[PDB]
Amino acid sequence: ATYAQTLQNIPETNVTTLDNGLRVASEESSQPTCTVGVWIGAGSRYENEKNNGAGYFVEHLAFKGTKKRPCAAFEKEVESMGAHFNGYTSREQTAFYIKALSKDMPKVVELLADVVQNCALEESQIEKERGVILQELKEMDNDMTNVTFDYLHATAFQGTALARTVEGTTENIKHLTRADLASYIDTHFKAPRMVLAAAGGISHKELVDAARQHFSGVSFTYKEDAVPILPRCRFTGSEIRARDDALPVAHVALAVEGPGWADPDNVVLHVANAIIGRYDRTFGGGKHLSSRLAALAVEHKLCHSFQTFNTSYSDTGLFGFHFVADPLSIDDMMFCAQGEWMRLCTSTTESEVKRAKNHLRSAMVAQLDGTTPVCETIGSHLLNYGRRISLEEWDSRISAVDARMVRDVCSKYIYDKCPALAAVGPIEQLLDYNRIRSGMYWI
């Protein structure tokens, strides 16, 4: 059994569309346990100034009970069957999924449908969650990494929809109405914009059957079955500096505009990010790590950690890096980090990509380690590519990448571009934008 053969012998992903426009996909295995859920193409980006934080507010009630079954009843039923009910809401994507015994795939599907369609939106529960959410905002306000990424979007996409955070504003949370949440749900949780995904030991035909039975409510007009294209979010080379010398370490995030899901270049960017990789003070590897930046970080004690990223979206994305450092080592870190980015565009090696490619393969294989992670892939894939992409296709694409390709693609999105910068904490040593902007050319 060779890597290739194992990739080809992986069960295919089945997809079937209902008349209402919903899509049902699943990957079959021989596991007594499974995961199934509905991936909705909704999120903060779809909200506006008045209902920002609604999709999040909803994410809080999506588990507090439906019309057919109030809170206690809803919970008991799920708990008593050993099933796990989780989910999340992001900027362009939302999800509600359940982990359970394949033996219950059908009852689950019924439960899912009931959650996405008949949420009780208990008037009293709403005021109760209003206070919970407000506490979660204070908890997250201490999460530098997330404060930093929020700020990164706040400036990189200033003036637009991606600038908003997923959780929403304090004013919105304090005044969102039972009607607003309701409106949100009806406006966005719609068949053509949803995907019923499942993985494990399940019959695609049994899945699609229960699907037909519970995901009904078809649409009449044309405006109800058309998936709205969102208005473009303008990228802006800029920076937001939130200084507080009272914080122990500083977080910095720099990024250029990314291509967006459908673009093939993304395979190259991910290889590129693989070369620079990531690091943190507990990587036993130490000073021998392959990632040059990681090596320098260790030798010069440049940071506590650093990480690259290539966040995608429908029509845009953020390609960059983030690091945490002591107030006195920020400048050298940023220096080396930008240095490496220059190296990418200019002097990438075949060896470098050979390694990065292997690293990338095992990384994609890791994101399919369990029923939930695989289910997440399916949901996301159909929702972003409108079709599942096998590990064999990815590997096909990854294999085509070479040093020259990395250089051209990287030169394309990085070289001499105006980045977006977010710095939080004791950031006095971080030099100005103009200085950083110069680190964008020559290497």
Place this chain on the structure above:
Amino acid sequence: GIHFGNLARVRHIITYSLSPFEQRAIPNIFSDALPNVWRRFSSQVFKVAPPFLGAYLLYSWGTQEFERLKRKNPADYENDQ
């Protein structure tokens, strides 16, 4: 020699800037620049100008006085014969 990083203890200040390429080099010349040049000029003219005006006068006088004293005084030859 090396100072960035140990200058001041600062807290709770956010700043926002744009790349030089996203903005205009010399914006709002008429709605902002000139109006301000006028403001600035105005708020200083009566501080600066005055002493220089006086210097100018003293100059004008002293110069004219010097030349005046070079002229002839007809009353020095009235009864000359």
